[PDB]
């Protein structure tokens, strides 16, 4: 439904592969995060759904992450 850039989809995939693969002592899960495993799971799901992102509809001119 929303369209991400391949730039983002690739990076978020690298991000999650990296973070999930770090041992506990280098993971640096910060204070605000509740359940890191639940977050990783959700990211992978999301990434599948967004795999079909149209590359030209992604070019909205405004970032997807923004404060309300």
């Amino acid at each position: 439904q929303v369209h991400l850039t391949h730039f983002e989809l690739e990076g978020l995939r690298c991000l999650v592969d990296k973070l999930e693969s770090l041992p506990l002592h280098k993971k640096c899960v910060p204070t605000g995060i509740e359940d890191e495993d639940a977050l990783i799971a959700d990211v992978k799901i999301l990434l599948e759904e967004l795999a079909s992102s149209d590359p030209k509809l992604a070019l909205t001119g405004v970032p997807i992450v923004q404060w309300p």
């Binding site: 690739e10 973070l19 890191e36 970032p63 923004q66």
Partner: protein, 329 residues
């Protein structure tokens, strides 16, 4: 140093064209979305960038008073590329000393002046605000809690890398490097000028870079002579420059100068950002020269993405309530 700088400055052999020369109004988020901020950019004037800077005749003594006479500053000893420290009052004295009586060549590239009087005097390009991870991903209440204006890690509430003042004397040279955590950089030339060498972060080049860092014997090798293509290019006063993630660069200071600039991560070249972080890990870069709270920021980035898209939060209840309170402002 073992190689000859005057020649590196003189030759035409650094003739690659990497830079896109650009209008300020064209550097928007769509540009970022479509190109992934892969190319160094130069804006020959500030028009449509969104930047604010101090009085044109701002001096280093004015910088000193905004940040404090007694503040400790990291100063590079140019002939060793090693770091020392002094107060800003002492730096100012050194900087104000006439060129011939200056005993040694010293450079300051790491004065971060957020949470001082100076900080409101400088605004970075609008577009950077839209994509900076610090602004857009780090919990805002933590960022806003920052009181300490130095970079003391134990007082740091967020990655304090946004606003640097750089004060370089004629003849200063910073050897080839990649910026921390593969951050991208925006650099505005307030007074003076700079000469950059640029080497692209191809897989081959980044392997030469890493190997060069592991060699130690680095004052010996001019890395721009080891790569297929290198662009030397001069920034003049008023220009704004953007270096993309992972770009290997070195900088010479031809006249006494003052630069305002800052570093930022963003969501469009994460793999390069991760690649650089791990070069730093492998070559054992001490913590002080690295991006603070990097993996912490990465975790918050994932949470923001999931939340903004799917509206499921993975922040603690407390953190959601803090966020909610600031939405209500």
């Amino acid at each position: 140093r073992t190689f000859d700088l005057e020649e590196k400055l003189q030759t035409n052999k650094y003739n690659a064209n990497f830079v896109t020369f650009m209008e300020g109004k064209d550097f928007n988020v769509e540009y970022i979305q479509r190109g992934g901020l892969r190319d160094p950019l130069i804006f020959k004037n500030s028009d449509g960038l969104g930047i604010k800077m101090p009085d044109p005749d701002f001096t280093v003594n004015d910088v000193k008073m905004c940040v404090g006479s007694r503040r400790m500053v990291d100063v590079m000893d140019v002939n060793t590329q090693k770091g020392i420290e002094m107060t800003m009052a002492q730096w100012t004295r050194y900087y104000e000393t006439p060129e011939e009586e200056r005993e040694k060549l010293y450079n300051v590239i790491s004065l971060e002046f957020s949470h001082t009087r100076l900080e409101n005097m400088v605004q970075r390009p609008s577009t950077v605000d839209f994509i900076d991870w610090v602004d857009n991903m780090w919990p805002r209440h933590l960022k806003e809690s920052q009181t300490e204006s130095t970079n003391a890690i134990l007082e740091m509430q967020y990655p304090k890398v946004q606003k640097y003042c750089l004060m370089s004397v004629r003849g200063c040279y910073t050897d080839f490097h990649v910026d921390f955590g593969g951050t991208s950089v925006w650099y505005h030339i307030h007074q003076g000028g700079k000469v950059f060498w640029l080497i692209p972060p191809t897989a081959h080049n980044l392997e030469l870079y890493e190997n060069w860092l592991l060699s130690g014997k680095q004052g010996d090798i001019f890395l721009g002579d080891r790569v297929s293509d290198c662009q030397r290019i001069e920034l003049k006063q008023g220009y704004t420059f953007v270096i993309p993630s992972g770009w290997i660069h070195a900088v010479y200071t031809p006249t006494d100068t003052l630069v305002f600039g800052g570093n930022f991560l963003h969501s469009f070249n994460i793999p390069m950002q991760l690649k650089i972080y791990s070069i730093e890990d492998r070559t054992r870069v001490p913590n002080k020269f690295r991006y603070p709270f990097y993996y912490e920021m990465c975790w918050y980035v994932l949470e923001r993405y999931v939340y903004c898209i799917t509206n499921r939060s993975h922040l603690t209840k407390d953190f959601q309530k803090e966020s909610l309170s600031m939405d209500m402002e």
